[PDB]
Amino acid sequence: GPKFPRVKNWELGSITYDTLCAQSQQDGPCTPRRCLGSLVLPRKLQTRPSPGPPPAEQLLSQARDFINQYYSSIKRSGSQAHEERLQEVEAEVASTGTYHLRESELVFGAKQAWRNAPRCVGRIQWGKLQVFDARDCSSAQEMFTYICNHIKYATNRGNLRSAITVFPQRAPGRGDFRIWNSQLVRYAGYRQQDGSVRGDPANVEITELCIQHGWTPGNGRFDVLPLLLQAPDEAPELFVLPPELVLEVPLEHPTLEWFAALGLRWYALPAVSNMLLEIGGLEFSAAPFSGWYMSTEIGTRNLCDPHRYNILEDVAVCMDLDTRTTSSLWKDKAAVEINLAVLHSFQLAKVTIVDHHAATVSFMKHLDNEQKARGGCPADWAWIVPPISGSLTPVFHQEMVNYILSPAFRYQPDPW
Amino acid sequence: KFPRVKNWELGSITYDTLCAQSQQDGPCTPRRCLGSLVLPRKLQTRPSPGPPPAEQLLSQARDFINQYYSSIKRSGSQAHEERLQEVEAEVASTGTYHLRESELVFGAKQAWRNAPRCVGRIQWGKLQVFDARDCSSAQEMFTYICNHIKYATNRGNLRSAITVFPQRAPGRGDFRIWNSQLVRYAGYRQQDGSVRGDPANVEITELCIQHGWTPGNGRFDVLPLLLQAPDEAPELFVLPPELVLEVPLEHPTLEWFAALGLRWYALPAVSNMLLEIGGLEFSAAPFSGWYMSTEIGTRNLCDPHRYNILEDVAVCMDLDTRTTSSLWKDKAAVEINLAVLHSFQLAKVTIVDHHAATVSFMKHLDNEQKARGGCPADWAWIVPPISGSLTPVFHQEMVNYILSPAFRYQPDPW
Ligand code: HEM
Ligand code: HEM
Ligand SMILES: CN(C)C(=N)NCCC[C@H](N)C(=O)O
Ligand SMILES: CN(C)C(=N)NCCC[C@H](N)C(=O)O
Ligand SMILES: [Zn+2]
Numbered sequence: 006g007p008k009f010p011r012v013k014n015w016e017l018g019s020i021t022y023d024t025l026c027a028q029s030q031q032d033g034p035c036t037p038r039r040c041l042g043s044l045v046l047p048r049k050l051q052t053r054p055s056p057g058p059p060p061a062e063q064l065l066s067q068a069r070d071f072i073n074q075y076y077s078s079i080k081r082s083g084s085q086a087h088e089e090r091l092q093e094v095e096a097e098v099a100s101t102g103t104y105h106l107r108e109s110e111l112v113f114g115a116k117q118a119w120r121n122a123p124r125c126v127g128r129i130q131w132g133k134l135q136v137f138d139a140r141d142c143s144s145a146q147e148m149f150t151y152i153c154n155h156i157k158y159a160t161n162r163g164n165l166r167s168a169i170t171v172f173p174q175r176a177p178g179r180g181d182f183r184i185w186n187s188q189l190v191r192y193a194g195y196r197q198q199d200g201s202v203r204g205d206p207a208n209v210e211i212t213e214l215c216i217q218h219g220w221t222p223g224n225g226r227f228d229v230l231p232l233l234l235q236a237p238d239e240a241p242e243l244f245v246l247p248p249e250l251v252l253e254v255p256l257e258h259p260t261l262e263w264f265a266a267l268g269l270r271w272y273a274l275p276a277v278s279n280m281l282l283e284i285g286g287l288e289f290s291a292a293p294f295s296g297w298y299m300s301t302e303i304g305t306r307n308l309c310d311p312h313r314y315n316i317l318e319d320v321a322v323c324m325d326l327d328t329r330t331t332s333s334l335w336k337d338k339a340a341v342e343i344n345l346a347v348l349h350s351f352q353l354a355k356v357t358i359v360d361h362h363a364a365t366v367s368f369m370k371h372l373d374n375e376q377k378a379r380g381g382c383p384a385d386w387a388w389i390v391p392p393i394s395g396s397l398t399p400v401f402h403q404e405m406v407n408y409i410l411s412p413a414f415r416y417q418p419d420p421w
Numbered sequence: 422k423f424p425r426v427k428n429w430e431l432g433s434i435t436y437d438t439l440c441a442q443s444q445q446d447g448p449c450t451p452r453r454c455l456g457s458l459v460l461p462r463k464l465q466t467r468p469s470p471g472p473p474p475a476e477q478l479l480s481q482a483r484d485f486i487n488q489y490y491s492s493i494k495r496s497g498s499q500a501h502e503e504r505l506q507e508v509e510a511e512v513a514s515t516g517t518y519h520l521r522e523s524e525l526v527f528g529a530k531q532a533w534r535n536a537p538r539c540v541g542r543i544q545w546g547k548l549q550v551f552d553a554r555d556c557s558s559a560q561e562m563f564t565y566i567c568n569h570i571k572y573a574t575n576r577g578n579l580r581s582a583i584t585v586f587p588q589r590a591p592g593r594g595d596f597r598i599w600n601s602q603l604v605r606y607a608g609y610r611q612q613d614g615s616v617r618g619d620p621a622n623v624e625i626t627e628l629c630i631q632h633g634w635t636p637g638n639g640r641f642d643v644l645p646l647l648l649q650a651p652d653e654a655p656e657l658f659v660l661p662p663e664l665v666l667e668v669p670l671e672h673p674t675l676e677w678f679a680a681l682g683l684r685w686y687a688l689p690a691v692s693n694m695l696l697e698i699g700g701l702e703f704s705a706a707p708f709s710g711w712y713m714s715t716e717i718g719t720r721n722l723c724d725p726h727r728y729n730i731l732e733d734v735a736v737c738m739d740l741d742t743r744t745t746s747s748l749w750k751d752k753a754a755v756e757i758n759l760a761v762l763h764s765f766q767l768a769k770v771t772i773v774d775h776h777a778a779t780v781s782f783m784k785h786l787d788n789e790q791k792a793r794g795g796c797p798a799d800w801a802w803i804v805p806p807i808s809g810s811l812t813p814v815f816h817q818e819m820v821n822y823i824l825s826p827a828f829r830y831q832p833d834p835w
Contacts, residue, residue, distance in 0.1 A: 392810035
């Protein structure tokens with residue numbers, strides 16, 4: 006039939022064709038010889054640092070393309086405003102080598118970048134995003150206020166609201182605005198004498214960076230790390246977040262009275278801060294965004310992963326399961342109760358969270374919406390399916406096509 | 422060129438150089454990845470309008486022969502050079518050639534080894550290859566199939582085996598087993614759009630009745646075989662009940678579980694895939710080993726479009742089916758997978774849980790890293806349907822490609 010990828014849902018037997026991928030202008034890791042689609046960081050979703058400004062011709066084509074998407078989103082394609090804005094963009098690039106976005110253009114691109122994110126299962130909310138323009142920001146101290154305002158608005162005392170704060174874009178012949186941290190709120194990871202790690206092993210390097218930068222450490226599993234904010238050409242400055250600004254949730258179990266005694270907990274606000282936001286060829290090296298958590302990110306990955314908190318065995322012992330044999334499914338049983346504890350704790354603390362069932366069910370609805378809207382939806386299957394109960398969720402049985410659309414959230418090298 | 426692969430749990434890194442030997446193409450391109458698709462019309466070995474080009478068959482054959490003589494270390498000897506001569510001579514004159522029993526045995530083991538969607542590949546060298554190329558009727562196929570079943574089953578101590586029927590010929594129809602597996606349960610489409618039995622087997626159950634089978638009305642009725650000899654109508658053959666070992670499901674602690682009447686067969690034997698060795702294609706080559714517990718407890722019994730028992734079990738467990746946040750599905754699922762493992766263990770029938778299986782797969786990836794420089798794996802198929810991150814494969818980046826010999830998908834004969 007049609008010349009586009011055929012996609013099937015094995016649960017419903019329904020078929021769809023992805024015409025949207027034809028719009029992709031950025032290559033992926035795969036080739037007809039082999040699939041590199043399971044790699045987290047292939048050198049195809051990562052934007053290396055441009056020490057030199059992008060070739061004026063390449064920037065122009067990305068700019069022209071973005072503007073067209075903008076005017077198209079407002080239904081004025083081919084209009085005088087459209088042709089004038091295009092003229093104004095190449096004019097800017099002509100004399101300055103770069104250009105700047107209008108306010109409403111930034112809002113559009115940021116929402117599109119999220120909408121374009123293949124690894125996000127929460128894209129059904131893509132239209133509801135608070136874009137805080139912080140392109141005026143000129144100091145590391147100002148970055149702190151902006152971030153503090155972001156956390157305040159986004160947190161909204163448990164009734165979380167999606168938001169992003171965009172700092173000045175990459176300017177040739179000038180340093181980047183970078184947030185050294187991976188997320189705004191992160192737990193410290195202390196490298197012990199015996200080699201082990203107290204806290205979160207994932208955050209070991211940054212913790213050692215904060216220390217080297219004057220931070221006076223603690224010695225707990227759940228210590229919130231300070232921010233390491235960097236303004237153009239200046240070394241990073243350290244800023245400590247006010248405790249009242251960081252909402253956390255103490256984990257307890259609905260029935261297992263002893264779970265509370267484990268002293269486990271997690272922060273309520275997930276805010277990625279190390280990713281690059283690329284819009285029309287313009288790069289925004291510092292542009293933290295946040296929304297809310299899906300229960301499995303905390304209860305399964307953060308808490309149960311071998312290279313993270315690794316609490317599966319401890320909880321199994323407390324549940325008195327045969328941890329000596331795999332066929333007892335002690336890992337499956339503890340993980341279930343751990344995920345249930347996260348849900349219960351967040352629901353009790355009136356903080357926003359969504360479980361993996363509801364989450365994926367809403368993504369399917371997002372998929373139908375997008376099929377009608379753009380004729381497809383770029384999705385990364387491995388990241389869309391939850392880390393537990395995979396086939397129990399509707400997305401498992403949904404084939405998916407993955408490709409890179411712009412605007413987009415890309416990975417970038419560490420500033421150090 | 423060579424993909425850098427990484428294990429996020431151990432921080433280890435490896436470079437896959439085995440993918441360079443891939444000659445067959447997948448569905449992916451630089452524009453978009455199609456790796457999550459079960460069967461693109463591409464890889465599929467569909468029928469043809471004549472004899473393959475001799476240039477290609479010859480090169481696919483020479484490569485395979487080179488592979489075989491390399492396996493037995495005689496790479497270069499006279500036996501190698503003469504086997505190549507024999508193949509060149511036969512392809513040139515007949516437009517085809519035939520394999521020796523030893524080579525076929527090597528090929529079948531190398532097909533399994535090359536299977537990207539197989540998690541049990543650590544058992545790859547342990548395979549009983551029954552040569553059935555001297556078969557000329559559906560009736561003979563049946564006898565061969567029963568022999569395979571009785572061997573593989575082995576009173577519960579399952580053994581991996583494969584029966585290879587006559588290859589495909591440019592001048593005639595194919596030898597085919599219409600069923601997707603030798604043992605399957607019937608799916609009868611009831612009046613109200615409903616489905617009694619296994620829904621995934623509705624079409625094949627219908628075909629059996631079209632060809633004169635007297636059906637039942639149980640949720641677990643074993644289907645008869647539809648074996649097809651070249652250019653002939655398929656024939657119906659009912660498997661002897663004593664040959665088909667089935668396991669009644671019960672829970673170690675939940676007494677009411679047994680009362681649900683659930684049960685599952687012991688032998689998982691795929692009969693609809695095509696085995697390709699050195700350019701030759703074997704359209705009927707059923708293979709079997711043993712189940713990984715998730716295949717039955719999660720997929721077969723819990724998939725929405727299968728037996729879909731999730732809710733019923735939850736109700737029996739008296740769980741909160743009102744909200745998704747009570748994780749009732751996850752809870753019911755775990756007990757079902759537990760009942761399966763307990764049942765196959767109680768019945769002295771070979772089974773492997775996903776934790777055990779995936780750990781052995783990690784070991785296998787390692788053996789293969791030193792052996793061939795890599796290992797084709799389909800991450801989506803390797804990672805179990807439940808508790809994915811709880812297993813080591815989840816944290817392992819994988820490279821997927823097509824190596825030959827290979828098990829490929831093929832059209833339905835009807
Ligand atoms: C509103 C609720 C949202 C939910 C529940 C949600 C959920 C998720 C989940 C489960 C992941 C997987 C992360 C992992 O496994 O490590 C993810 C990834 C992602 N989300 Fe969303 N998301 C939401 C909001 C947002 C917002 C507001 C943005 C951007 C404006 C966004 C951008 C992304 C991106 C780019 C990724 C990919 C991260 C990566 O490549 O590592 N998400 N999201
Ligand atoms: C030793 C016991 C074995 C175990 C535990 C095992 C397990 C598995 C599992 C779990 C799958 C995925 C099935 C699915 O999701 O539907 C699979 C697929 C596969 N296995 Fe293995 N396997 C074993 C033996 C074999 C043998 C003996 C062969 C062939 C000689 C083989 C060839 C394959 C092939 C070709 C597939 C792909 C099937 C498809 O595409 O539908 N396996 N195996
Ligand atoms: C609102 N966003 C972006 C998210 N829900 N998740 C982003 C990654 C969070 C990470 N898995 C974590 O658990 O920290
Ligand atoms: C011995 N082989 C290859 C297997 N273990 N499985 C093949 C597929 C069986 C199917 N998932 C089923 O549930 O019947
Ligand atoms: Zn791919």
